[PDB]
Amino acid sequence: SLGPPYHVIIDTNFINFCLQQKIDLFEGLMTCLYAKTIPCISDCVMAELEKLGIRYRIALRIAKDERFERLPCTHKGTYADDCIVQRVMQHKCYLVATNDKNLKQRIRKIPGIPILSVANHKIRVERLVDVVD
Ligand SMILES: [Ca+2]
Ligand SMILES: [Zn+2]
């Protein structure tokens, strides 16, 4: 029910993991999912990219590409991990792309939210179905 127009919420560091592994975000997500995939970026994830500066410069530009869908934040100017977790609790129409061990263990509590991570020169499906309370 997630689609085969797939919506993938990007966390703050995911693009950087992609750049480190010589992965093009867009092709990598498309290849991982075998269908049109839409990378998504919340307002406050986008603000961190503005804020953290030099080593997120190339991430910032990539995040401003046409193919990104921007997700407005209906919350106070806050917390990138909490932002994703709150969004995928309301709307189960999302995947989460993160290599962050703590965010993943929070997402694994939420049924139905697949996790993608960068590994071995590809984006892989890290969490397919299983819940860990
Ligand atoms: Ca969309
Ligand atoms: Zn937010």
Looking at the CA of 5, which ligand is closest? 1
Distance CA 85, CA 106 (A): 7
For the chain, the domain total comes to 1
Question: How close is the Cα of 11 to the center of ligand 1, in Å?
Answer: 17
Distance CA 62, CA 58 (A): 6
- Bridge partner residues of 127 (DSSP): 115
Answer whether 13's CB lies under 8 Å from 99's CB. Answer: yes
What are the structure tokens assigned to 52, written together? 């953290």
Answer whether 12's CB lies under 8 Å from 47's CB. Answer: no
Technique behind the model: X-ray
| Type of residue numbered 75 | H
Looking at the CA of 91, which ligand is closest? 1
Looking at the CA of 41, which ligand is closest? 2
Question: How close is the Cα of 69 to the center of ligand 1, in Å?
Answer: 6
Q: What is the resolution of this structure in A?
A: 2.1
Range of the domain at 88: 1-133
